[PDB]
Amino acid sequence: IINRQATINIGTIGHVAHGKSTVVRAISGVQTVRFLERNITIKLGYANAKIYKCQESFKSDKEISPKCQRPGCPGRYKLVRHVSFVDCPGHDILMSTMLSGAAVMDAALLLIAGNESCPQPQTSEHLAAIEIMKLKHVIILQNKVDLMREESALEHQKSILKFIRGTIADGAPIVPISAQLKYNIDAVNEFIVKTIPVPPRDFMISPRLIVIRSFDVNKPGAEIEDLKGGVAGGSILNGVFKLGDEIEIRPGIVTKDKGKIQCKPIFSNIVSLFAEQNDLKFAVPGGLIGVGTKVDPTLCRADRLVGQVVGAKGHLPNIYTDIEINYFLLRRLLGVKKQAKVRKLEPNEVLMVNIGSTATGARVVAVKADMARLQLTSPACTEINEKIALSRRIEKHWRLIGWATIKK
Amino acid sequence: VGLPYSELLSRFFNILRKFRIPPPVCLRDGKKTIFSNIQDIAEKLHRSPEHLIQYLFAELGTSGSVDGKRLVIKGKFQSKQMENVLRRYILEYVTCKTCKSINTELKRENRLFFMVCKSCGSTRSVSS
């Protein structure tokens, strides 16, 4: 069996102190990056899973290991798909990272424990975000069942069902799982295959890459005569990449420091692609790949490339510090156990605006009925339009208000 | 559809499975923290002595060496904050969340520690 790279981006959403990382571990095998320089820049735990199915029914088909001796069949498992995990943090402060993760995702996994409250705010917010940023493929998972009784679980399920009725999403699969006991993962794997169809992707589609991690591949005590190029740890949404292509980093750069910031996007040519373990020529979209470009190792230091977008030559995204948004507000706030009416925006206030992936905090300059002028501290970009999710600080946590579109 | 879920749930249901704190006999006589009673602690709670030392180091910036039963650790640390630390250690390093088992073993898994349980085989956070 040939070592094939990731095919579809799968993300995980939930609540704090539930154990999303644990779930990820249970699913795959490689331990999470989160909780100094190597595997520290990104807030998403990288997990390499495998889907190889034996067709010699229902749950007795999917396995973690490629070697098959556990179910009974002597034959080796057939090639289906390789998958990578993007684990977003489920904390109320670092929601920008979650939002960034969201746009990269193609499939979602919701986690709810059966011991806490039924109408959970953070989970609801996550769901809303998913709905906004075009992610109709949602799978519901139950985290803790062993601590609870027989009927209690049923009641919880019923409550969940009641909750998911008025929303846009209607057809969603539900699975009960244990992360610590290591069971019912096969069913989840099966669901991943059956329910979600993989979207068509050729070599003509507009290139789309998002860099989260930055790598400087240099040994302590290495000469200038033999040097390795700067490696950008980036995940591909869409568009198949190969060796020998022109790439531009789009959020701009602050170089000369008096001095205007009028400059071209950061051009680079691909040198090598780092996937799995060995070097590969082709890059299948839907996974985080260490793209080694003609970018300096000095740029890929520690905290300089955070959520910076990457595009192929002959497409033009744009450097934005001041953004022109057309926003729409909802009647009442979604994400409370005490529903409150949405107030009008006040001049000069810290809000969090996420144009697809770009994790940015913005201040309001002018307040209008439909339009908003926002000043950004961290760099942001615009492709063609991009679906935007809005979030505000009211009561300690980030809370969703509505949706936005850039008019340019 | 909530009908193939029920079967799964049923299947799941089918397939299913403190006075131990020792008195710290230590004088708060400081500058260098000396723990002579630590061997007893190691014995009673069933643990290697080095792991406790490592935990202590992780907690507070200290430097010392292991001696056979007795510790020579740099720092003036009291008989209440050290006690608190001990209490914490006994609350999370002995206790496993899924099943409270006795047999726990040391593993250096990359720089931050992650121990393994001999009964089942689960990775627990050896830092928080």
From Swiss-Prot, chain A:
Subcellular compartments: Cytoplasm, Cytosol
Region (G3): 87-90
Region annotated G2, chain positions: 39-43
Effect of substituting V175K: Impairs eIF2 complex formation by impairing binding to SUI3 but not SUI2. Reduces cell population growth
Sequence segments annotated as region (G5): 178-180
Annotated GO biological process: formation of translation preinitiation complex; positive regulation of translational fidelity; translational initiation
GO cellular component, one term: multi-eIF complex
UniProt-listed Enzyme Commission number(s): 3.6.5.3
Region feature (G1): 14-21
GO molecular function: GTP binding; GTPase activity; methionyl-initiator methionine tRNA binding; translation initiation factor activity; translation initiation factor binding
Signal peptide stretch: none
Top-rank taxon, per record: Eukaryota
Effect of mutating I112L: Impairs eIF2 complex function. Strongly reduces cell population growth
Residues annotated as binding GTP: A17, H18, G19, K20, S21, T22, N143, K144, V145, D146, S178, A179, Q180
Domain tr-type G: from-to ranges: 5-201
Phenotype caused by lack of the gene: Inviable.
Additional free-text comment from the UniProt record: Present with 20800 molecules/cell in log phase SD medium.
Its job: As a subunit of eukaryotic initiation factor 2 eIF2, involved in the early steps of protein synthesis. In the presence of GTP, eIF-2 forms a ternary complex with initiator tRNA Met-tRNAi and then recruits the 40S ribosomal complex and initiation factors eIF-1, eIF-1A and eIF-3 to form the 43S pre-initiation complex (43S PIC), a step that determines the rate of protein translation. The 43S PIC binds to mRNA and scans downstream to the initiation codon, where it forms a 48S initiation complex by codon-anticodon base pairing.
Protein name from the UniProt record: Eukaryotic translation initiation factor 2 subunit gamma
Stretch of the intact protein here: 94 to 519 of 527
UniProtKB/Swiss-Prot annotation, chain B:
Coiled-coil residues: none
Position of the signal peptide: none
Zinc finger (C4-type): 96-120
Subcellular location: Cytoplasm, Cytosol
Function: Component of the eIF2 complex that functions in the early steps of protein synthesis by forming a ternary complex with GTP and initiator tRNA. This complex binds to a 40S ribosomal subunit, followed by mRNA binding to form a 43S pre-initiation complex (43S PIC). Junction of the 60S ribosomal subunit to form the 80S initiation complex is preceded by hydrolysis of the GTP bound to eIF2 and release of an eIF2-GDP binary complex. In order for eIF2 to recycle and catalyze another round of initiation, the GDP bound to eIF2 must exchange with GTP by way of a reaction catalyzed by eIF2B.
Quaternary structure annotation from Swiss-Prot or TrEMBL: Eukaryotic translation initiation factor 2 eIF2 is a heterotrimeric complex composed of an alpha, a beta and a gamma subunit. The factors eIF-1, eIF-2, eIF-3, TIF5/eIF-5 and methionyl-tRNAi form a multifactor complex (MFC) that may bind to the 40S ribosome. Interacts with GCD6. Interacts with GCD1. Interacts with TIF5/eIF-5. Interacts with CDC123.
Family, as annotated: Belongs to the eIF-2-beta/eIF-5 family.
The protein's name in its UniProt record: Eukaryotic translation initiation factor 2 subunit beta
Parent-record interval covered: 127 to 270 of 285
